[PDB]
Amino acid sequence: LTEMVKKITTMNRGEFRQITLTTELPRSVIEEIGRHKRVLVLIPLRAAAESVYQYMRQKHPSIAFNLRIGEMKEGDMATGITYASYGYFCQMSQPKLRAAMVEYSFIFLDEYHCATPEQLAIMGKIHRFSENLRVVAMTEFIAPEVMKIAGLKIPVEEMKNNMLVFVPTRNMAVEAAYVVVATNAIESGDTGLKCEKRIRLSPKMPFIVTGLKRMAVTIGEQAQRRGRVSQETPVGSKDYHYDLLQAQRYGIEDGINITKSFREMNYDWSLYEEDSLMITQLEILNNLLISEELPMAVKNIMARTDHPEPIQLAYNSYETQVPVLFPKIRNGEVTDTYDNYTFLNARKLGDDVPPYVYATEDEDLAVELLGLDWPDPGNQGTVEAGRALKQVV
């Protein structure tokens, strides 16, 4: 640790170090450079931030500690180690963010492999002035599958023991249901699977289609599941493309292309695996997103809706200002049920499909099932994004 600390503490501004082990490290660093110096530690979850803050301030009285998980503390100059969430810094404009960030001697990006939208936006954004910073990024039974519990062959003798069954979907957890069949959301408060959002990009409009997908859990997630006490191989790396798309919301007001910032940061810091074609397509779409000032009406809706992906509203506004209500899909069939989110003031699908730039898996499915067709780009900007996407392929 004294090696790591000596390497960190000799760092010049405009330098970067990636470390693999992560909380006694910032402590050693501050004790080395001076207790009145300022050092920032970025943590994904607010709960995780508060938890470290508490743990550290109790364990290390003599070292000042700060917590930033709420409202922007204007003119903040708290000496000691500051534990903040990436989301805290998401409230400030680029200039405010830079002014805030350069006031820290060291910046520790903890658990960067989570790749949350707040994390991805902050890393791309601060990398924009990385020359002014010193940043350090920090990071048994095999059951067979059943043929003609959760699709796995488990001995009946194990039912006499206390069981936790990890399952990917909400439906599977109830259908199979001491024995508790719980989703990954269980740990918050193994089938090797999980349900996460994924994205598909194409030159054909809607260029973006997002939806839940059953996938393999990561080695980290498998470790978390095993830590509570299938033949499915875990992924080394989580897919951050949805998250990167959601992260784009954080550059709208500043007119910053988050996708370009991510790509440029990652080229310098080499923190994530890259899918060049996907990043390129996401970047073309990102340029479109910020090509014009967002209509005030759309800004307000995005701010007030309970819609799960308000960025969809921002993208679609390049074609339509009226949100559409697609009939819900229960059991592979189109129902007469609708998902209505607040402030949209939407019209129902009917037989008139909206010129969506950004759609959901289910919105696409309803269109297909009904035998309808998605319109084509209606304007030069949208037509041009499409040609650019085709060219990139």
User: What are the residues whose beta carbons fall under 8 Å from the beta carbon of 252, sequence distance 6 or more?
Assistant: 289, 290, 294, 314
Encoding tokens for residue 327? 């009939």
CA 207 to chain centre: 20
Q: Which residues contact 70 (CB under 8 A, 6 or more apart)?
A: 88
Do 74 and 7 form a contact (C-beta atoms < 8 A)?
Answer: no
Which residue in 285, 344, 278, 279 sits closest to 310, CA to CA? Answer: 344
Rg (CA), the chain: 24
- Residue of 349, 290, 345, 283 whose CA lies nearest to 315: 290
Q: Which of 276, 292, 309 is nearest to 206 (CA)?
A: 309
At 293, list the tokens: 């000032």
3 state SS of 145: strand
380-392 helix and 276-289 helix, angle to the nearest 10 degrees = 170
Same domain, 101 and 166: no
Q: Are 159 and 128 in contact (CB under 8 A)?
A: no
Residues 6+ apart with CB under 8 A from 96: none
Same-domain check for residues 245 and 393: yes
Nearest to 121 by CA among 268, 283, 250, 281: 250
**Number of DSSP helices (H) and strands (E) in the chain, helices first:** 15, 15
Residues 242 and 391 in one domain: yes
- How far apart (Å, rounded) are the C-alpha atoms in residues 321 and 324? 10
The percent of the chain in helix, strand and coil, each rounded to the nearest 5, is 40, 20, 40
Q: 135 and 148: one domain?
A: no
CA distance 199 to 209: 6
210 touches 242 (CB < 8 A): yes
- Tell me how far apart the alpha carbons of residues 246 and 384 are, in angstroms, rounded to a whole number: 22
Residue 206's domain comprises 140-237
Q: Which amino acid is at 329?
A: I
User: Are residues 183 and 80 part of one domain?
Assistant: no
116 and 17 inside one domain: yes
Q: 162 and 287, same structural domain? A: no
- Count of domains forming the chain: 3
How far is it, in rounded angstroms, from Cα 255 to Cα 123? 16
Q: Are 290 and 251 in contact (CB under 8 A)?
A: yes
Contacts of 12 (CB under 8 A, 6+ apart): 134
Q: How far apart are CA 154 and CA 159, in angstroms?
A: 9
- Examine the domain organization and report whether 183 and 312 are in the same domain: no
Which residues does the annotation place in the binding site?
21-22
Domain boundary among 204, 237, 270: 237
Quick one: CA dihedral 183, 185, 191, 195, positive or negative? positive
87 and 15 share a domain? Answer: yes
Q: Are residues 328 and 252 in the same domain?
A: yes
Q: Per the omega criterion (within 30 degrees of 0), is the bond before 155 cis?
A: no
In three-state secondary structure terms, 194 is strand
* Domain final position from 123, 139, 155: 139
Query: Is the domain of 264 the same as that of 378?
Result: yes
- Note whether 68 and 83 are within 8 A (CB): yes
Give the residue carrying structure tokens 């919301």.
249
Rounded to whole angstroms, the Cα distance separating 123 from 110 reads 11
Two structure tokens written together for 246: 């959601």
Q: Which amino acid is at 10?
A: T
Distance in angstroms (rounded) separating the CA atoms of residues 243 and 238: 11
Binding residues for ATP: 21-22
* Domain boundary, last residue among 105, 139, 173: 139
**Given the DSSP bridges, would you call strands 333-338 and 327-330 parallel, antiparallel or unpaired?**
antiparallel
Q: Which helix (H) or strand (E) holds 24?
A: helix 24-33
Q: Which residues contact 236 (CB under 8 A, 6 or more apart)?
A: 218, 219
Q: Are strands 80-85 and 327-330 parallel, antiparallel or unpaired?
A: unpaired
**E-state strands within the chain:** 15-19, 38-43, 65-68, 80-85, 106-110, 134-138, 163-166, 179-182, 193-201, 208-216, 324-325, 327-330, 333-338, 347-348, 358-360
Shared domain check, 164 and 130: no
